[PDB]
From Swiss-Prot, chain A:
Catalyzed chemical reaction(s): N(6)-biotinyl-L-lysyl-[protein] + hydrogencarbonate + ATP = N(6)-carboxybiotinyl-L-lysyl-[protein] + ADP + phosphate + H(+)
Binding site for Mn(2+) 2: E268, N270
Uppermost EC category: ligase
Name this polypeptide is given: Biotin carboxylase
GO molecular function, one term: acetyl-CoA carboxylase activity
EC number: 6.3.4.14
Residues bound to Mg(2+) 2: E268, N270
Active site: R272
GO cellular component: acetyl-CoA carboxylase complex; cytoplasm; cytosol
Residues involved in Mg(2+) 1 binding: E256, E268
Oligomeric and partner information: Acetyl-CoA carboxylase is a heterohexamer of biotin carboxyl carrier protein, biotin carboxylase and the two subunits of carboxyl transferase in a 2:2 complex.
Binding site for biotin: R318
Amino acid sequence: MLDKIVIANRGEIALRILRACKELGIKTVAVHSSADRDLKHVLLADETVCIGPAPSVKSYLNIPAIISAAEITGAVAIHPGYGFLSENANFAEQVERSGFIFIGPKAETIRLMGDKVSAIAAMKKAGVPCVPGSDGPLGDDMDKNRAIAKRIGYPVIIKMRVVRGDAELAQSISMTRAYMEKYLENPRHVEIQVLADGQGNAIYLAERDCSMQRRHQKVVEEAPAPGITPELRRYIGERCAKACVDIGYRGAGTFEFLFENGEFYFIEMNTRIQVEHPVTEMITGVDLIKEQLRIAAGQPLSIKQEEVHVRGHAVECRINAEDPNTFLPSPGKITRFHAPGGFGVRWESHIYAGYTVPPYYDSMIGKLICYGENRDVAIARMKNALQELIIDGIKTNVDLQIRIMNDENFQHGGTNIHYLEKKLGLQE
Amino acid sequence: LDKIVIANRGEIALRILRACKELGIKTVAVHSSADRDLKHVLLADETVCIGPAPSVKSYLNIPAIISAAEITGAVAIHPGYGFLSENANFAEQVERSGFIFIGPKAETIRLMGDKVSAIAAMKKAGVPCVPGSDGPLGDDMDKNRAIAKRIGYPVIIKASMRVVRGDAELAQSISMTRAEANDMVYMEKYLENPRHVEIQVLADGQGNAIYLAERDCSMQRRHQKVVEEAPAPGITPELRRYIGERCAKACVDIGYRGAGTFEFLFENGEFYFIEMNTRIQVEHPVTEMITGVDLIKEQLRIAAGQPLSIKQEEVHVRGHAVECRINAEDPNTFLPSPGKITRFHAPGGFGVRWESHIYAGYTVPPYYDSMIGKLICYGENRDVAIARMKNALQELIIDGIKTNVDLQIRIMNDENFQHGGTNIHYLEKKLGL
């Protein structure tokens, strides 16, 4: 076990990491911006270091400042959390080069997956399903061209016009010039959790559905994904796990796919922990942060795939300080706060009564996660929980969350990536 | 069930209210005037002030409770734990008044409510009880020693402090015991260092009953439970099945209906019946963690007439759970220590469950008990559960009053508690009581 580590992050995720550390007896060092002196985790850490002024560029994105805090404290490793420098290669490189342990994949691995090109290339070489297309630009031979569209399967997209049958091809292409790709009108956002030890072992931890989005930002997450069967689960899961090995992946990562008509289409890989990891912990019982830490300590993968069992259902609602009708950040002082409690209710947040939400950072202030033996139960608990939560002083999206829980479509399951914006009338 | 009355207060009342909500059941909160601000009361569908502060006048007031049910059109009453939960007259009146009592029948309450009757009934069903001479002792030393040999020393001679540890002192203790005290004496097995292991059951009132593993509640202070855990350390699947089956049988035998618990003394691999709690217990959540069953919802299903949903084969023990009761009390006297909570922060995290009605600004009344919350942590193993509890206790903030938080931390820090299997006297010994 790692003796002591630096938590290069803030807010919710910093507190989540802190608890994992404490459970394993790892000392913690909280680096913070002058404006986060009062963060809950800061108050609970073994040591603290002010790394700069408020602005992330000056604090949280200040590499030298974080490396230094590692060095002066005698820390052995650094945990980037999510966001910030978690997917910054330079950072990782430096960390190691500086003699520290980066709690994530290798910098090479990040570069690899960081670039969309190298990424799909690797995924195809790996056997992971990517979006089908022309495989290079198209020409004049519409006798030819139409042959590939057939192969692709309408509807197709010329890139950007959409075509559905032979007929509209010609003009479509012609008025376009003025590549081809398979078109996914109503897909779901399905992503797979993986863990690899760098030592050749890799397992997948089922999937999560994150279709409820606004501006390409996940608002509600759930696991497992409704409609996904074991075979489908196994097919994709195995493939993701194989890819890990192929690319020499180390740590926790997520393969995100678009899902439609029983098929998956690789979008990207997050080479780090995600916001929504808790839903997976609930249905599998695996603590993902602890595994991260173990893998970092050079330990082999403790879990065997056949040991990974999905039970029950879990839902996550992100709680943000923002005006629910403008969607404008809503920084401020929380005057009154009451967290929900009970069987199957998990609350992940650094906020407390009298805490002031700075304006400098992102608007997510907490995550509420409910688990049940089934989806209906999970949902029912969520509703209750949302009603117990109190957060006064600022505007939040609690009411919206409650409206989603109350949506028939949501309750039935299977809504697509467009539903939310559409339900809100964000299509205009 | 359409609507029910929560005939309790505090944490348990909130516990129940959440279960009714998930089930779509309508809630009626009855409260004393001093309990206007309870969290559950504020969340209930309907509220009714049944009396002034004092329990005798509100919570224990039968006719007030019943009337509240009538006027609201409720179909059942949930007694919770304590108060009137094990009061046969109450159960009886409830039913005769046209409401379903969420608990066993009054007769069962009476039966198990009388030690004599209870023991009597358990022996019958093959539930292990404390061994004894089964009737007064005669003046034949040959047979007396035979009885003592049968039970196993040490024994204690009771008349209708001496510990008999062998044959050499038997005769003298018996004589000496009569010389002192009708005047007849009896012998009983002496249990020097037992643990307190209790078995959780559910019965539908239709021939089905299941056991849901057990709980170790050995950490007690002045006979009050401080920490509870499940499963009990050192209990094998064999030993579990053995006592579990016995207890399910006793249920059928007595025609038990609802949630109930059989408490035992456990020593040297044996169980010895102490008593049966004919209601849900404070410590039920640790069972829910490791089995995944919502006991409060099952009590409601059962009351609705549903038979058991779970089959014994479907009951699985997974992980470990530890519960720390949190009380507002005087550290010397242990009496309630009432007042205004100025600052409050609850712990959170994976495997962390907090059961409490308290909140910042909330005032703890002097009228009731000192319990203000229950913190339960779960882990894939006991060690993890403890670690989590240690951290959770550190995050918990309750200002403005005196609580037993420090004592809980000391306990979690105890080497013996960490080793596990301490007995019923450990806590007081440690504390010097």
